[model samples]
Target: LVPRGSHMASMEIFGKTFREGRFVLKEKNFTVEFAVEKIHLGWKISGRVKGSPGRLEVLRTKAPEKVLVNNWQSWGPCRVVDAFSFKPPEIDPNWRYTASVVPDVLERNLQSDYFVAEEGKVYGFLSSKIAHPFFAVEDGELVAYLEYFDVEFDDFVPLEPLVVLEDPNTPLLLEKYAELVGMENNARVPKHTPTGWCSWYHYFLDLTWEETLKNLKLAKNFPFEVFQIDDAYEKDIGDWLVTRGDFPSVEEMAKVIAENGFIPGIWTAPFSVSETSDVFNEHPDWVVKENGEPKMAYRNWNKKIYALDLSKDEVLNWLFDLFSSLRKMGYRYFKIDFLFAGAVPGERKKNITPIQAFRKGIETIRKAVGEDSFILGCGSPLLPAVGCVDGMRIGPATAPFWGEHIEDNGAPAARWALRNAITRYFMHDRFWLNDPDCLILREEKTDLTQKEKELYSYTCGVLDNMIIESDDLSLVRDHGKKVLKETLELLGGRPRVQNIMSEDLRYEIVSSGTLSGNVKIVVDLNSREYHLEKE
Candidate 1:
């Protein structure tokens, strides 16, 4: 016969008691449920399963929601399962599950509220307000508070290795391209001509229409393929796509940019909406709310901007349509800014992690723009963007204006550029281009010395995946022109290193030669004199 509390346990999953509990199964397959006086709301369950050192999960259940299982480590070398399913009486309808294996410790806790699952474990957490899903053992009576759900595991096959296309007549050699970026294999090398723009230099909103027209004209003088209008064009920060009174016609501006022999690019944040925007006025439902009011995010111009909810289909459709309209206006590139959009304050939702939400939002844009258009992703978490975007801004935003060399005791741009050179040099293939911010050659008052400029320009040429020059082309000095030409030539050709030494200071020699006996060399971290020879 069933226990006294069996009636309560047999109810629907969402209507059960013992709302959330932890159970441990020892090696012998016996289950033991530890009892506690009260399950503190929002308490997290983090533990590693013995026997398999790699099988670790942290389950957290916030108030009024189901539990979420996240991988202890973000990226994993362990086997990963795709989906976990449980039979009726174990789990209720309307509940879904997905998983990824933790790759390493650095990625773990990098961002909370996301979980990766191990294969065959069939482990995950549940969410519900009613507390009848589990039972409390008391007075030697097995009082059934909730029914255990059956668990199922779905395995995911590893992705196939990418193939590199080989062509004999093409001027570019795949092997040479791979070698220049220090890529050991062809899989990491990208396939397309990486195209993008630096917002401040080419398209800063501070410029007047006359100045804007001049800048656009200047951009036309170079081989810069895409021109992105950066921040300041909007009426306010979060009111995306709304032009200020300065530029009367965004469509005409786009056409003007396109007419100058470059593709028009625009910047936007998917999740943020200014308090003064029409979006906030028309659709409050799209904004993420807490305590029955719209939630505020830091770093916004005003604390009044609200994060968009990707879970809602209407919001997604509206964003897609907005991008679609831009695409029709001869816009070919999109720079998605404000990388941290999916993160929520306080508690996360059940079944959806910030990573999933981020991917879903970006994929929606890609779908709207079609596959041919280029996407430059910035201020975003890195891993989730593996195959989604065409290019990414690698380092942090540089000084908004040139010559503002205000180094706040942190690594200066020159140092950061070098560090990024050593770190991200290997991933420069199609679909994963790295942007090393913009090159500033026209700053009137500057903090960077001549040595620093040489070092910066050399690093940009040898290490950067995409090249962006922020100098006013019309005002380029003869010296600046020489440097620019050298930089462009280095970027146009393959990269080669002649020497590498690590001692009191690190040093390296990078060289690239053409069949015409022209060669370029770069020295880093040392003032040693070097000689060059060409055949």
Candidate 2:
């Protein structure tokens, strides 16, 4: 047995340490206590931390051979590394908001938010991201803890539970972990995996209404279920109801798309407000602040964007009204993007953790949009939004060209994007439908080869993820059409990455009970080649 005070495993709380059993920290104002239990998988540690508990440590154990580091947000890297040699990358000062959702991302070389795994075992959190649980390797030991971010608790707050699973099959272990998370949060997995059309990858920010109308007419020939407008329609980041250039009003666009016999969808960074936007200009006091001034959350569209303080009642009311209005405008599918801004640590109106405020923000949006509307969260902290969002962009934005030059630093590139899709595939049906960005298959204005397109689309299908195409219809010819058809035939499968701990860029993906048959695909990402087998 792993003892409490020994180096094998231990727990730390409030400057005091214990090896096993229940313990309490009787403070002058309040009390904190926790207990450990042995479960089927390994062990679970949970308790209550009342008063000003700075942080809570659940478990610490000897480091393993390989460590699977899972990032906090959707777009960050989720890959395995040698525990002895791995080193965390320093946060780029300019791209700091990329780590704003979890600033402790670089605190340890072998650290993971929510979960970490070796070749044969996995350690994960079962509850929500309320206290921001994380695991780190310190001095050849693995440590697990939950961070409160200095939020003083007057009432008792439950610590997020941790579960350590020992299994040789890493993919199955990850799936089982997601299953427990789904049960804990009542995760929202829609009955349908949407096949849709989006405007961003094709026309980008220059999508005029004429191009949209042309595509709307041509979309009749395609098998698209949803017709969506993307970032081009909005006048500003926070100004969702307004339109820019030749685009019509938000309601008019939705009505037009619906008239063409498909589900109308739209995109919005609902929690983001640019300094130049009318919303931010008028209500500067409504944002998250530092030193009594609006805190710049991130830079985008050549402007300093701010995060709305979700802890404020007025901000929640604004979100409620905004989404309610969108739902009323005949749009049933909503892609809420750049959601890390909403969860950035900063001074809020109420004294609460950023994760807690983030949950309230998303919950309010969910309530306003009604249960039937589809919500796709992008660039979000994953665990907290599981129950609220029906689908999630599980990777960075995929582009027309597979960017071989770009590294895996949350940049928009097909290579890194597809890598994330493969690594995080276990979350597909368990937490929510994983959206591997979109399929960019146009041949006219792109650098992608036929093999690359086939590899991406077919792999996504084999994983049974969302298959939304983002391309101009006129540009898709015989080859593109044929690949899409074959890709669709590979759907409806229980997929597993056969080699989950592969350090090389090659992945062996296997899917059973698929529409086509049991299939195996050995893809060498480094060589950009694949071998397929089916039975």
Candidate 3:
């Protein structure tokens, strides 16, 4: 009997049902209240908000003739739009993409937001302990926000929201909503699936240590096993171990890339800093401030950056002694990158909820890089970096140029990184190990087009993904070493897209076993063309 203006009934919230009053919400100090029960693959939606909230909305709704948008990490592009033809986020006078968020010329829900929508639905949020589940679109209607990245609870907390429905399987309800977001807070899937060689698209910020020891002396001729060292050997963006301008020491560059054999990767932004860093000039009270100063959080290479206040305990022991001194300097492979500036949105000495300060700074860099090192997660935040990332750059940033008229805006394109790695390839291997970013196979320094590099290397080798290659291995000849040895014979397969909800960006990819056993591939991403059919 506790239901009156229950936002006005006909709503399910956990099994996808919304109809009442067609939605209306716009909180600031909180006031929500919804409840419905029945578990195990069924009913749910419990909330009890009272005061101090921050953001939480529904606002309007009339859009959604087709919906499903998700990306706040590893290369945005999950495809599906027509919530009345979204077309938002545009004011373009070009400030390099008006201060940036870039998607549909800036953003207003033209992209960025949504965990899945359109019956057989899934919307997320169980807890970063407070808020994080934002969807956009307003004025023309259709919205639903909650990012609470600057928490201030008046204490009535209970938001726990998840509304999954699997009826006509939207990719098996996105793998049963990633097993209910990996049982809502027990998610962490990545035990292995790494093989590398990153030097930021063949020397970008002018990488050099003699072209990194001539790609560690032509990287053991190839089936590379991890030699990474991107972003110009540090010295700024929070100087990870200081080796600037001519890098000859981060412990002798991972002891010459593990004595020139491989497995010594490294790249970090670890919640950026650069205001002429020295860790932001000797820890100006360790970043993430606003009116009290600092704050910036975004903007790079040209400078002005800041963020790192994982609820500060001396900033999580300076990120556990800087990832435990890069795991005692053997540097077992890290990447890390922008990490959405640890869930940015201002002020936080500690009140939590910028996704619990971005999961206490990635669970303190996964307990100081413990499990035999291999982190990956670039500019991340997909499903709370599940189990603390083992590899997750699912798309964007892959350019020796092939951005097909570039404009996903963070620039650097391999056609917007193989179109967000084929629109987020079902959160790859179920939530870790997807990184379809690197791989330039130099047939000469630039402008991809060998049918756009065999349609982005046979669709990231029939989507088994994670095959690194950045070139300069003595200018990779012989058709770039037989396209990196036939793109590792399309790696140990098990991938299937077959037009994931096709709004038509073209897809039909298949991969069932490799070494040429069964691999389809029909991709047509706006006519670059592809048709492989091996058996």
Candidate 4:
């Protein structure tokens, strides 16, 4: 029997009959046709849909031993979990929209957005060029679907292609999947990984020019390449070029940072606007609409936030001009954040999928900034923005304190953050430089002990991802400095987590041909202990 949308379509793999070859599924107002083809290491599934496809189910089979569940955005959870034992966490309403594009997936059974895998086999989508792709386990059976999110269509719309790989060695298999995605999108994998200084972990929302100057002077002593001014510098969410109290104009700050001999870096939620923002107030029509009014994408900064309608040419032009202005100001490094908002399912000016609009928005920014500048994507849809960004934040925010009590639902915590960095290590140097957040090595004002700090710093280094230090310079004495130094020595490697599916919170990470040499490290997150070996 074939699994169908309205129970209509038969193909078999792994002892279960999945819909294969060609079949059409029809409901009262929806219709779709699917085609499956045999490909290397797996199979490919694609289709075209008409009317309101909504959430269409395409495949079902017995659940595997463990499923690699991926959150829709960069800051969300990316970990392997036993299908039977795993339970999704309850989320706060405020965090519901920000943390995931499909918050209901968290409410139900185990869900893997974009991809999932077990010890030897992998299942994933090759591209998010059209529809949003995801997998979910329901009633002891694994199911797959392309979520149209209720967007109506009069003509047949192409869906994103799905690929299933039945290869041994989950880590390498995952790597190959990412490579295929990179090949499809021409992903931006830069030759050089950036080492930098960020203001967030230390200053938070209280960062001022005085503290920035102090760090700037002290940064000369450290081996830092880029100096970034984070969130609080902006006057409001949409006013990227404007500064709030005590901060200088954006251009002047960039000029000052450039004069200090470091790459001038800045952060912006480019596609998001608060109700209080000048952009939103002046141009409410520019946002994605609900019914006939502006739709609230999410709540942040104690205000309602709206997503820019990327389908509009005016919005894309505004985005292009914003980045272009930043580039003209000598700002060469950009951390574009909260990008998931841009791809939220809603009514847009143009009759296209949210994904198509997302690509256009990112492509506009990429063209404006040019190839020489570095673009780090955060809180973004992982698969959609692959080619445009040079670096990608692969985990949630890391804090000065290890969040032992915090749930693993996109909250700020060192433990879960490190877990994602290890679990998603295969994506490093493939899709883009996997940014494992930042390293907080301060000896003061932090609950992180020397051991905790070392565990994080060493793991990120062994993975050979981006290594940005975040702390007050005066607090990082000999111990913190030495930890950063030793971590740098471990850079440059193709790391593999030997125990990719370990449920005991222990990881065996190995890297070949690092700056120091081939290296291996066994870390027990439960006990905060690690054993390092170098060859």
Candidate 5:
């Protein structure tokens, strides 16, 4: 725990120590101790809690005056909030919010325990080896706690270490923390940032093979290196490799795309199994359960979905075969989405924590897919996926229309999507290549204005994020084509975003080494304006 602090020295908050605090908790004939050792910038805490320590909190630190909140998943928003005035979100019994185990835990209020301070300081969990819960609580005073889990722990479990930081510059502190996290996780930072095209945001579930073929032919004229077929091709979730409607078998789909001179990419919610799926009907016991019956991971696409029990060897073997076949089918780029399903709390085949189960499933995919594949993680936990994925969609789904009127709760919207791109820009390259969602540049069959499209496109470019377009080439006219062409010039820029902890909606961003030379962007979310500079 960080000691109380005041005054200044060497342009940073100093004299912070953790030696004053040591304590133990005793319950159910189990003992757990909380101890900390002095580290360079923060304290390294270690301890163990016995079986099922529900809502366990190891150490409590007085909440800072203001702290930047960290989202539980990649798509969720990250922002600075007042600790004293903040309120913890109330959890809803229903609604999975797709990728987050506790979406409401991130949705409703400030998540401070996994946070950073405005005064050039940060606090983050070192590893996601176990399910560690961090959130701010108010008793008489506001406090932050590094918790273990809400589940049973039969044996002594090593707690996830915490890194509390203080630096002269806050953004520098964030970058430094990311460096430490990357080192700890052995993160995979891709040598080449990919630019590609996907079919989901455009045709969605209604996409046809005819339309896909047309784009594959037209995509060559554009600068896409990867051509991906998204959700619509699958017959159902869990039962991958099967085709529905006019969609060909998985092999033919990838073969056609690869033959067209671009790497074939495919999408799958690998951890999800719909009740209607053939796999679910054939092997009912493969799923994670709360009782004897299969547990619902989340209700999505109007179907009840169950999570695969990663602890089970049969389930792991099944996943391995599924991804291995896809790799053999010539698909090199994989978008494995809805990953939080693997971490949903329930009765599993083994007594491991949800975090362990989640890693098992993800790690299996990595090994099966091999190092040659470009893995794009979406709707995933932020830190755990560092070493596994090459790129990650860091925002909500983007649509052809502006979504200012929509709720910020994971709904498809251009406005909300771009907001996350700017807010979560700090994670770009440091975690995995940041995917600022897809670009929807079409002159017709949409409602977005010219400026709106450019705003989303350029911000993604300046941030050095993966740029993937999702639209029919025939519908994209002059202005839309120009937006696509011009945005590409902003790629390759090493970006630095400013005012991440801003009280107002305006933030400053600058990117160096861009094709068009050094560029700066000032974004005003309140006014919805982007001022781009090249000098």
Candidate 6:
């Protein structure tokens, strides 16, 4: 736990050491810890509660009219506690907010007695609304603020004995992502998007082994870096190693993919087990169930899948072994799909919240795979995912074949592309890389005009810059190839334009080149034309 003023030397405040202190409501049978830090005028306090079952009631001394804690939001000073109100200044809006508590609140007790908090026993908090910033700004400027009074415990009650174990495995998801974003070492550097081709097996059932090899070879002819084998590689969903008859051997396929100069990527959901899986047959009690019956939590592929009870020690060990086996098969990148599957609504276990279970599952996978493997997260909550994943699917999947046209010239692909571009603008550089899904420029036909295609490609390049093109190389036309080359060049250069006015769509152009020249008025949004003069 880092002290508030130690790293951020500019900020001045009282009780710097109290930043790590927790407030426990012993009378109410609840306890919460605060890891407070300076954010603008007041301070940002992240709260975590013990026992993982109790909800937090955030109280502030400033506005005592009503309680201010609940769902996370960026705007407005809602009533949390009667007198204390959290008024986050709107100057810098792209701030992430979260609150959480480990099972053990006291330091000494946690060290000597607990075997780490129980799975569901930890709770986390975050604000609802997030202000997505376009670029990195100077740090130490007040971005957001929250306040809470120091707790004074009146009466202490002795609880049952608890044991805490040493946490040796570094928090993989958080640390890897932070390092990638250059946050951990204070580098403040950005990484160029890793280009790759992924075989979305769900869309193509008739895809044969030969066809898979052909597609991989075609991808190698292009700029594709990774070849991902999505779901359907295994005979059963949760059964990791069993390959279908068509694929024959997973090892051969991985080797073939590697021989073609592409990294091997596979898909797996570590915490979920289909009823047909061997693990399910052997350990039925390990499944997460509500009351006395196993919970049929969610529907996927039109089938009901049971969530695994990851809080159990044996279950975690089993998952670790599964991942370890996959890693041994030459798989370096893992696409963990349906991460939200284990988080069933209204299902809570002893000392384990759904969020904590979710985190533990991820940690288990990371541990088994070791530190070097790349993990791509999908279908997961955005806030909790911070510091956890290397990349995420930012938009919905595009349709297989183009059908009906929209706006006379727009294809169904445009809808998905536009949505991807827009959302990428909002989420880019917020810790992890934003995945805008795959694009098929060579094979899948589009009705969009050249202007529209350029617009789509430019937007994609500027925002979530990762580009995945899944098209047969033989089909690409010369014109299309030129466009693709230009798009890649633009993406490589990081051509960025600053938004001058939010209300009027004004922008100033800045070219990334060796010569640092004066600013030019390249885009006049109001006039809808380019201007070469300095702003």
**lDDT: which candidate is best?**
4
Error at 212, model 4, angstroms = 0.6
Give lDDT tens digits, candidate 2, residues 130-213: 688887788887778787877888788888877776656778888988898898889998887778899999999999999999
Tens-digit lDDT track of model 1 for 30-138: 2222321121111122222222211111222111111112221111111111112211122111111111111121122221112111111111122211110122112
How far out, in Å, is residue 481 in model 4?
1.6
Clashing pairs in 4: none
lDDT of 3 by residue, 262-305 (tens): 88988888887888988778888888887888877667788777
Candidate 6 per-residue C-alpha lDDT over 216-263 given as tens digits, one digit per residue, 9 for 90 to 100? 766755776778877766776567777785886777877888888888
Regions more than 4 Å wrong, model 1 = 1-190, 194-197, 201-205, 289-292, 302-304, 344-350, 400-414, 443-445, 492-535
Candidate 2 vs candidate 6, lDDT winner: 2
RMSD of each: 16.0, 2.5, 17.7, 3.6, 3.8, 12.7
How much lDDT does each candidate structure score? Answer: 0.45, 0.84, 0.69, 0.86, 0.77, 0.46
On TM-score, who's better, 2 or 6? Answer: 2
Error of 4 at 442 (Å): 1.5
Q: What is the clash tally of candidate 3?
A: 4
| lDDT (C-alpha) at residue 55 in model 1 | 19
Error of 4 at 257 (Å): 0.5
Model with the higher TM-score, candidate 4 or 5:
4
Clashes of each: 29, 2, 4, 0, 3, 50
- State in Å the error of residue 121, model 2: 1.1
True lDDT of residue 475, candidate 1: 55
Tens-place lDDT per residue, model 4, 508-533, is: 99999999899999999879889999
